[PDB]
Amino acid sequence: MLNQELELSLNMAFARAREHRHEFMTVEHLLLALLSNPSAREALEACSVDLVALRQELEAFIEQTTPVLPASEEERDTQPTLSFQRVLQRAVFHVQSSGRNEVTGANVLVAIFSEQESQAAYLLRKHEVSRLDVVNFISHGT
């Protein structure tokens, strides 16, 4: 089960991908919607992330590459890339092996790092963040 906030952030980015009529919702869509998620950004801020240079780089890349539906037919709905599906699952599955009943934004953030061929991850890694870093912050704070 996902925490109220994460689910907001999801419904948020989803609702955005329909308004711009994007065929697929990617990780990049996610990592991005994550940028304005309490739990997520705290971690990011804590790693000294340019919350603005990211947002740009992502918004920008989401654009150049996300196929858009033909204005013609509406018998199609935003399909989650496989990568999205996987991130989301690696996070639910971990929050599950910790007993705590709710998955947090940061929980998902850590997940993204594991989709090694996504941009969202290359971005995060370009901004000097690392899984450890995010994880270290969530486990203790430092």
Partner: protein, 86 residues
């Protein structure tokens, strides 16, 4: 030291049992082609042996390859869809 993730070509591989109309349909449904081009591309597949249907981010292509392959599987034909690095 690090590089943004490659782009992937999404290929269609010819086979002797898949009906061409299916291939054409797959091309139209999953790649937004009009009949003119769709039929051509099919002819490539058929005579070339394979054909590049489009080029996307690895993250996306993996997904198109999966959808095309299922549809194939669901409509009971061996039409193979693959991907390659740009």
């Amino acid at each position: 030291a690090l590089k943004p993730p490659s782009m992937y070509k999404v290929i269609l591989v010819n086979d002797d049992y898949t009906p061409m109309e299916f291939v054409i349909d797959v091309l139209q449904k999953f790649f937004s082609y009009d009949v003119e081009r769709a039929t051509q591309l099919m002819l490539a597949v058929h005579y070339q042996g394979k054909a590049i249907c489009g080029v996307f981010t690895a993250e996306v292509a993996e997904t198109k390859v999966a959808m095309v392959n299922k549809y194939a599987r669901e409509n009971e034909h061996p039409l193979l869809c693959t991907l390659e690095k740009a």
